[PDB]
Amino acid sequence: MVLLAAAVCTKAGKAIVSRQFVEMTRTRIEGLLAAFPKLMNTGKQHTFVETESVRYVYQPMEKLYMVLITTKNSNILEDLETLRLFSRVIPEYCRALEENEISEHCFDLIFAFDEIVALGYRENVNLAQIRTFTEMDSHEEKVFRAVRETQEREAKAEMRRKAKEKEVDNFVDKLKS
Amino acid sequence: MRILMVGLDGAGKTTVLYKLKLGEVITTIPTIGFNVETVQYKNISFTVWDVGGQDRIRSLWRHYYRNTEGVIFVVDSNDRSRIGEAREVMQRMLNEDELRNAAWLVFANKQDLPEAMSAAEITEKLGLHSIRNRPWFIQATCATSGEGLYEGLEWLSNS
Amino acid sequence: EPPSEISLKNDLEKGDVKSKTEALKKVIIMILNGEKLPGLLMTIIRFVLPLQDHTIKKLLLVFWEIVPKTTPDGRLLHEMILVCDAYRKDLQHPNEFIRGSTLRFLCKLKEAELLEPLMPAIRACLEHRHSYVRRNAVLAIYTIYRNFEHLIPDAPELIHDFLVNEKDASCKRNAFMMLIHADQDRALDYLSTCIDQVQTFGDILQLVIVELIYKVCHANPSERARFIRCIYNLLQSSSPAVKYEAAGTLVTLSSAPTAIKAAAQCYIDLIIKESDNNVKLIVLDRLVEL
């Protein structure tokens, strides 16, 4: 993990959608987080705030915020890419932007979190390709036609049966000293 | 129709099934659970629960207590063991009323596989001789044999 | 006397999957509250072992996952073993994505009576030429290691040998992450091996070692040279990530005036290069510590 939740946010004091990598507690961790986020703490601007060693990572994208959270150190850029990246992905994933579309393609969207990121690891590239992996496959089909068919033959037949029946060193020395 | 294959499945009770279904054989671990197939005839597509009569699974089938429509009893005709005991159980099916909504088939399977009883011998023995408020013609299979089955069945859906 | 639970039931028929989808969403929302009262279970039960609808299964499944499962029925609703056998098959499924997806789920999953022969099952799936599937096992296993590590007991080595068989960086990266959590030692042995090769390689996996090494010294040291030999190589350092860590780890390790200098430089340039201010501040903070 490098993120116990990704929650995609809309301005509302409320985060439009979320997923809980790990359950234990109740939303109050998440619920409390939601509250704080909605409040924004009046704070003016800035796309990042970490407070109390918790990264609250966000990106306004419009009236929307996409949010990630973490507490101990990270390499920034990567991160950014993601926020941004989210901001690339959605109109594809759930269709454009307005909660509803997403409301219909919730399943798709959550699926995307997992898919995209396996526990804080940037899994791939290529969205379409990303579609590919599941509920879009190939193997299963290959297998099915042949198999189904084979069985079918047995069945058909059955129908009848039925039917009828240097450098290093510089350092090293210095140090060594 | 809900058609029931019970007894402990893994013995090739399941074989019996897999043989129908793909032509194949038990290439599963011996199978406690629901095995499902739909077989279409009179286009009543018979949904077969090949379910082990192993402990829980026998014990617990209440959601499957609903109303029957077809009976396969898949038989170890080398079993001639749990059948009296079975008879003793079997009564409670009899004591079920859902259970009286099927014109059926006991299938004697596993004939080659060791031997089998008098078609009659069994008939009393599971307590089978005694019915009528459901039809009760008898049909032997084996599990490496069985034909004319379908005569049995023929009458059966057309009851 | 009657209820809309039933209303949903007919819809499902009416559409098939489609209607059911709707039902899932509703259910979901209903579920979302907590809320539901049972009975549809039966329906679900009835149609689903004999039905496909993959997506739906995925919805279903997930639903099961998020929702409880040690449900007041048991533990299990009590069928947690029987239905699974199809699923087990799916899990078996020659069909690799399908297994992988399951696996993904499975990493989320943790339902034991079902697991046991699925332990066998999984083992087979590891062999499948797909790194996706295999990788998925790495999470899954991780999931075991806390829940019922023991379930499998021979693993840490088994993995470690596995690594030997292995060569997909993605999977490797993972492999490390888990491996040290099981035991560092194996990683280390390998570490010894890898020492020269590292430089050639992709970062992500490299990172993970940096954490590990840290904890152990405060507890105890005496280990250096072998490391050093490498470490110096690491004093190439060049990805912004690498560099970011690389100076950071160094300080962790050392603070010799020479050390002080080395890291310092890295920063200074970095900064200079640097653009995201947020970042800039951060290092200060470290610095502030410093």
Curated annotation (Swiss-Prot), chain A:
Entry-annotated residues carrying Phosphoserine: 177
Record family assignment: Belongs to the adaptor complexes medium subunit family. Delta-COP subfamily.
Residues with the N6-acetyllysine modification: 166, 174
Superkingdom field: Eukaryota
Localization (cell): Cytoplasm; Golgi apparatus membrane; Cytoplasmic vesicle, COPI-coated vesicle membrane
Originating species: Mus musculus (Mouse)
Role summary: The coatomer is a cytosolic protein complex that binds to dilysine motifs and reversibly associates with Golgi non-clathrin-coated vesicles, which further mediate biosynthetic protein transport from the ER, via the Golgi up to the trans Golgi network. Coatomer complex is required for budding from Golgi membranes, and is essential for the retrograde Golgi-to-ER transport of dilysine-tagged proteins.
Subunit structure: Oligomeric complex that consists of at least the alpha, beta, beta', gamma, delta, epsilon and zeta subunits.
Protein name: Coatomer subunit delta
Curated annotation (Swiss-Prot), chain B:
Top-level taxon of origin: Eukaryota
The keyword Lipoprotein appears for this protein: yes
Pfam families cross-referenced by the UniProt entry: Arf
GO biological process, one term: protein localization to Golgi membrane
Residues holding GTP: 8-15, 31, 53, 109-112, 143-144
Record-listed cross-link Glycyl lysine isopeptide (Lys-Gly) (interchain with G-Cter in ubiquitin), residues: 110
GO cellular component: cytoplasm; cytosol; Golgi apparatus; organelle membrane contact site; plasma membrane
Function: GTP-binding protein involved in Golgi vesicle trafficking. May modulate vesicle budding and uncoating within the Golgi apparatus. May recruit the lipid transfer protein VPS13 to Golgi membranes. Recruits polyadenylate-binding protein PAB1 to COPI vesicles, and this is required for correct localization of the asymmetrically distributed ASH1 mRNA.
PANTHER family xref list: ADP RIBOSYLATION FACTOR-RELATED (PTHR11711)
Protein name (database record): ADP-ribosylation factor 1
Gene that this sequence comes from: ARF1
From Swiss-Prot, chain C:
Domain of life: Eukaryota
Cellular localization per UniProt: Cytoplasm; Golgi apparatus membrane; Cytoplasmic vesicle, COPI-coated vesicle membrane; Cell membrane
Predominant location category: cytoplasm
Presence of the UniProt keyword GTP-binding in the record: no
Gene Ontology BP term (one): intracellular protein transport
Tissue expression: Predominantly expressed in the upper one-third of the oxyntic mucosa and in most regions of the pyloric mucosa. Ubiquitously expressed including platelet, liver, heart, spleen, lung and kidney.
General function of this protein: The coatomer is a cytosolic protein complex that binds to dilysine motifs and reversibly associates with Golgi non-clathrin-coated vesicles, which further mediate biosynthetic protein transport from the ER, via the Golgi up to the trans Golgi network. Coatomer complex is required for budding from Golgi membranes, and is essential for the retrograde Golgi-to-ER transport of dilysine-tagged proteins.
The protein's assembly and partners: Oligomeric complex that consists of at least the alpha, beta, beta', gamma, delta, epsilon and zeta subunits. Interacts with CAPN8. Interacts with SCYL1 and PRKCE. Interacts with COPG1. Interacts with ARF1 (myristoylated); this interaction is required for binding of COPB1 to Golgi membranes. Interacts (via trunk domain) with ARF1 (via switch I region); the interaction is direct. Interacts with KCNK2 (via N-terminus); this interaction increases the channel-mediated whole cell currents and promotes plasma membrane expression of KCNK2. Interacts with STX17. Interacts with TMEM115.
The protein's name in its UniProt record: Coatomer subunit beta
Residues of the full protein shown: 19 to 308 of 953
